[PDB]
Subunit: 477 residues, 4 copies
């Protein structure tokens, strides 16, 4: 059970300012807790404190930044079940998927702990011509300054971690705005950070609705905005950011290709397709939305995938036997069911699932979806997948690329040539081979091209964005 | 002598579309040549051709990109004197400084030739926890796509090279808009590239005035805008760029510190201060504008710097004995002379030089300039320097940092502690030790923080910005 | 108190084979414990088991190797005081220096834990010319195979750790022979490793006297010999090693230079000189043996160093107020006192200390030692230091280099030029600036040139030596 | 035609000391030239001069080392046909293969030119724990010192280049002993180097027979021996080398696997198998000796390979239509024909070729060769290949590994799983996919494990071996 109320964190300190943000249990619909909602005055105060903490943060030695991160790792391990249960409530996340997220939260912070003590530089040969005889270069990474972080509803812990943990490793103060539907995970991160010896102003965690969050984008005291969320929002915020650096982690309509040589592997393939399409009710930025299957294996794959989809239990996410929990809201279920209805009216067929009861949307598989349909081209963000057929690998690649988006794609194949062609031709951040696009391991470079992002996360890459190189050129004569 | 007319380059081809852009000899004021001016229809056509060339460019093997760059190097060596003389005319650049720029143009292209065949990736351990057993990552750099390049008047060849050469190494088509006051250097680069086997649309070089250049910032078919020019313009273009990545190389009011231990080195220090403050008439983004001298050596430095400044010959830049050529225009000379007059009226003193005859602005040294004056705080971009005194090194560092800007700074010292403190505390892209901030070698990371830039040039760093990483995750079971 | 007896570790298992190796308390001289001594049959069996464990070790995933190392870290933290007290007894090491070594043991294993999950490779551009169009390279590091490790008496824990920890990170089975005078630390490492899930044959820890240890050098089933010990032994073993790779970590007569600018820093300098010369009774491979002091500060340094040397308490290493413990044996004290006597007979002067009572050799400072004396040129390995004067920095560098050896040197200076010159000219593995040569941090590359070594330790560098690169060249057509 | 006589190069200077080494045309058998043979007095003088050149070489700036290498590249391009014709004569190398070697000589020197200006170091975080607060590390690569180089007969130019070019890039003086059967290529390299501004003693090129070459291994003034040649010699020299570092590039009995999925690719596979087995008469350290073909494609591959082998013209290597030139001597042809006869007597069958006329050994293919035969297990080094069959991929890998050797192997496959398994399991330096093991590109890491080598060549890797790291540790307080 969640605590009755939660504070926000203003310049490292818990402030029980109000109880104005109600957070519901996404399965029962009951109010599960109330948290303090930050207004513009509080946001402004947090930003000023972050400016004031910039020098103290920059002066922390590497091993001290590591020690802060290690304290977080230890506390997250100690509170593992509490954290997983909180995710289950506030995100409606099936308990096995919630435990999966807490395991990843720990991985992300542990990678950051390791990277905090290996932010190395280079000794550069500058003697490339006679004019530069006797010069040598030395590099270091300096913290960029105060960072503005905005995170989405669907991984309340780990996607905040992908900003918070590298900021601490890099030596940047930050102000984090979690999603209002799922703020508790970030507030527990804040609680744990408040136990450490960080300078005042090193961090704030401030719940705020989007309509009250302008300063997170526009305030000129932030030197970086790093936003994870919908493409419609992220590209709009880039336009308003001003001088600061912008990093965007957005969405897409990810595809998985199943090649002709997969007959003897179909039970594995189907298990992974069902995971990617339907885990956490399809609410993943790399959830499987489109499945392109080679004609040689299409019928066998279809039959097994219909049976697998029908087998997935929907219900209370606290029950470990539940695979499909509630979607995040009835309004989001209605968005997706409208797209599904429109695809069917235009000729598509529901071949497994299809029933929708409020936010309880069954795992659903469709055939014959037109490539012009919203269900095909927009980001479904729910427990639906589209199955389509191809006859030659080039056509599968073209159809994956027939999208505004480009986050990840997956290919199940034993062909070396097809693996190489996919790497060459798929206009995505990441191509996964012999697993779904929905796979991520927390050290890997991660992000999108096209409308799906601008930049990469994963600890090393976030540290790079959160620092500025400073060159020392030394002339000897 | 320049050719009578020059074409522009539209999708690799010379087009003598008109003679509407007059280019003056900046010393005599006479029209030296006329070049074709691109309109919006031509700019749009160039962008479409760049889209069409994206796939052919991406498919060029590394050694073929290298061969294009090597052809450029060979031709620039063959045409060395022609190129230097063209710079002398169109930029009013003293012939020794013009030869210096051509030497650097060759360095920049040679570094790019070397880097074109070493765009390596990583094999990443992904087995950081049990969930990721059997996964491995492989990385590559993919060209970002069509690039929009805008360059300034003062290094007509080398600052274009810092965009063009890495684009070719990385496999990106590009459209370059040179400065209208100095377009010839870029058009000679275009002429040389037109001799190579590049696919149609690989490059365009299009003169256009700023008021006709909106598409270089706003067109959504470009995936990167890389702008080198004034801070007032660059920050405004970032706001209008839309989704594309933005790189900015801007300006500043660079300082050099002369430490207490420099008495026996003062003739060297003074020679370098005069170079940094007055070469190419102070028209460098890292020209020395402010000189902070320790009280122990202030008087001796002052005396030598007055004598050195008075010794610098001003006149015809074609004469190898000329040190100070014309400024780029009478209007720019009038801007700077107005700031100088205002500083004097407020209490400053001209201690060497000070005479202004049209665009012929003498090398000038001032004392007693208030830190609130435009001459102190804005970008002088002319042959003036301000001398000021300090008593302890911390105060010198604070005064360097007392600026909107942060491009480079220099420190003449033999103190290891002061060298370390400068690297820690100077909020600049680069700190130069025992030379002026005006030093750059073309492989080094180069750029500004604060209002002076966003990102780095130097070949390796430009290639990074002109590419997207693409991860291949391979699962073995 | 040590346990009454210790086993050896044969293919991961404790074997109480005999009690034939007596280990004395180096202060009291009493037998403190008895340990099992391995004969040739046991050594041969260990090597065969290491061969048999090669494939299982190579197949362990990275995170499992990390988990083994993490178990060691946790157990060493839990047993910190026990480990420090054991060092105090078996090595006669002052308790503060013993705690220092255990702290370093933990650092070494923690660095190895981090490095175990970042043994990355490269994706290499191979398209350097037309013949190689369509080829790409991919690299990995494969364990070299069974490793033979030999460690010395003076850091019974940490110098074994610098071989054991990287071997585990790299996936190599190993057989370790500790020093017979100080085997207990290695046997506690073995005890802790025996608690982990490693495959049988992953490790053996076998006490054996040098005269029974031929197989550690000659057996052809080992693919690497890594030896830490005296130069006279190491160079002789290289000759007998056969086909295997050889890494040598040897000794020297390390020097510290004190520059002319150090007057206001002399109390710091003297504190560090006394640490480097006299900690663990001078029994460090990078102990300060020679002190070169600039004429400007010589007298002031001399006076302070005489007073500091006289202040160092000699006695029972279990007492935290003891600075100078016993030397490792009376025979080693007699070796050094003979060299000291010979230097005095030839004209040197003892200016502080000089009294020798069995293995209790006082911290001692000499002046006027001829550069031809054994005390100058050979490895003292005891609590003596020689002070000499210089007038110009070039002469100090020449005198540091006037040696068979080249491990580390130190320079106390604030001159940037002198720092640069020292890095250029000192023929050593490592140059330390503003600390003694006796400083090491366990991640840094570490080793000697000239007669002082061949190769580097420090975790990353040891992993490199304990692996073979394996290139995959893939041709696409 | 070769020149009538050639000098040797002693400390950069041509010395026509004698004409005692006759070099034959390996096709006609006539003496083609006579070269000066170095005695022990000359070898000793060269070594002393290399010691004397160590400091001047170390002080050369990077761009000057690059300029020396660039001069070599330009001269080799200018003299391309001369160099190829000399190889044709002294090595009996078919002119197309000789031109191939000269092309590679240029690649090797060009890679070295590029690498000479990018010998970078690292700025290392040393703040891993509180003891190391305020310390930072900086690295550089220092030349190791004088190098001893020994090269073999079969690539008279390029295998010398793989030692000479990195030595120059790294700043090491060297003494090169080419093969007495083929010294001319190395003497032309020496002639070209003698045109450059290198300090006296930077290089010597000294022909000497093995029985007069002891000092190349034993002299203690060399700090590295790098040997390319037979395994029987290389392992013996390691035993005699003393203190110096040893690098070995040796031989093997390389295998190519043809997988079940290759039917539609067999003409390509057969073309590459014939190249690898029979180019330069099989005289390659990575020549194809063993061909393992999957049962599904065995008969079709066999038929095509018999026809291809029979089609290869044997004769005068000056004729561009000749594929198979003479072997290096009649004695080497007799060695191999004896092994072939013994394999046939034990049950093997010659299925194509088999005729031997002096040094003219036809391209030959055998079936049914016992795995215990010398022809199978020893290094053939001539134009013979053995064909054998397998039914499952694991067995093919085991049979490749059933050898004393481990240089390179090749696998023709479209299976991703088999590619991965080959990389995991083949105990070789390099695994080539979709080409023969006989492929090398001159920048790639290259060398053997097991009895085939110790260390890697390829420019970057040779530079690493020819340098020592020197760490600078700087403490700030
Ligand atoms: N690339 C990646 O790593 C991932 C990206 N995503 C993407 O996130 C989306 C789903 O998450 P969801 O939370 O619904 O996304 P939203 O874009 O609706 O919201 C994301 C965050 O942005 C905030 N926000 C919205 N508008 C503004 C604004 N004008 N100013 C400031 N903050 C604002 C929200 O605040 P509030 O809601 O409190 O009003 C929330 O904190 C999908 O598109 C998905 O692909 C998800 C996970 C992975
Ligand atoms: N890994 C690699 O890069 C390559 C290795 N090789 C290997 O080289 C061999 C073929 O070449 P080959 O020339 O016949 O090899 P050898 O081993 O017969 O001779 C190689 C070189 O070593 C010299 N040499 C031989 N014995 C001594 C000695 N005691 N002291 C000093 N020098 C000595 C030879 O001198 P001289 O002949 O003048 O008496 C020659 O210069 C094969 O085993 C092949 O695999 C070949 C090419 C590639």
């Amino acid at each position: 059970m969640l605590k009755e109320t939660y504070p926000y964190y203003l310049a490292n300190a818990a402030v029980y300012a109000n109880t104005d943000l109600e957070v519901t249990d996404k399965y029962s619909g009951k109010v599960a807790t109330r948290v303090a909602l930050a207004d513009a005055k509080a946001i402004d105060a947090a930003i000023g404190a972050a400016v004031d903490a910039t020098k103290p943060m920059r002066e922390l030695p590497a091993y001290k930044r590591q020690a802060v991160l290690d304290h977080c790792v230890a506390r997250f391990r100690e509170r593992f079940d509490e954290l997983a249960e909180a995710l289950c409530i506030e995100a409606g996340k099936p308990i096995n998927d919630a435990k999966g997220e807490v395991t990843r939260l720990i991985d992300t912070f542990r990678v950051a702990s390791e990277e905090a003590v290996r932010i190395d530089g280079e000794v550069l040969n500058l003697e490339i011509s006679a004019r530069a005889q006797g010069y040598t270069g030395y590099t270091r990474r300096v913290p960029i300054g105060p960072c503005s972080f905005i995170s989405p509803f669907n991984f309340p812990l780990n996607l905040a971690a992908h900003k918070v943990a590298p900021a601490l490793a890099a030596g940047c103060p930050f102000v984090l705005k979690p999603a209002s539907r799922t703020p508790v995970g970030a507030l527990i991160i804040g609680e744990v950070l408040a136990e450490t010896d960080l300078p005042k102003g090193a961090f704030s965690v401030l719940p705020a609705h989007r309509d009250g969050a302008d300063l997170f984008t526009t305030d000129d005291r932030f030197r970086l905005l790093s936003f994870t969320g919908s493409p419609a929002v992220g590209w709009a915020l880039k336009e308003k950011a001003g001088k600061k650096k912008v990093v965007l982690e957005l969405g897409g309509n990810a595809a998985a290709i199943v090649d002709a040589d997969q007959l003897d592997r179909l039970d594995y393939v189907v298990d992974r397709l069902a995971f990617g399409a339907f885990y956490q009710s399809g609410q993943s930025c790399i959830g499987v939305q489109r499945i392109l299957a080679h004609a040689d294996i299409y019928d066998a794959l279809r039959d097994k995938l219909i049976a697998k989809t029908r087998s997935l239990k929907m219900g209370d996410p606290k029950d470990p036997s539940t695979f499909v929990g509630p979607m995040i809201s009835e309004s989001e279920s209605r968005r997706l069911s409208g797209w599904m209805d429109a695809a069917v009216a235009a000729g598509a067929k529901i071949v497994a699932g299809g029933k929708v009861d409020g936010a309880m949307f069954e795992a659903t598989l469709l055939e014959n979806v037109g490539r012009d349909q919203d269900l095909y081209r927009k980001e479904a963000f729910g427990p639906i997948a589209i199955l389509e057929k191809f006859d030659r690998f080039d056509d599968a690649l073209a159809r994956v690329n027939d999208s505004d988006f480009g986050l990840q794609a997956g290919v199940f194949t034993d062909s070396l040539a097809h693996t190489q062609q996919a790497w060459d031709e798929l206009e995505v951040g990441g191509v996964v081979i012999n697993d779904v696009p929905s796979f991520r391991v927390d050290n890997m470079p991660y992000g999108g091209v096209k409308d799906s992002g601008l930049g990469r996360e994963g600890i090393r890459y976030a540290i790079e964005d959160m620092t500025e190189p400073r060159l020392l050129v030394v002339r000897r004569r």
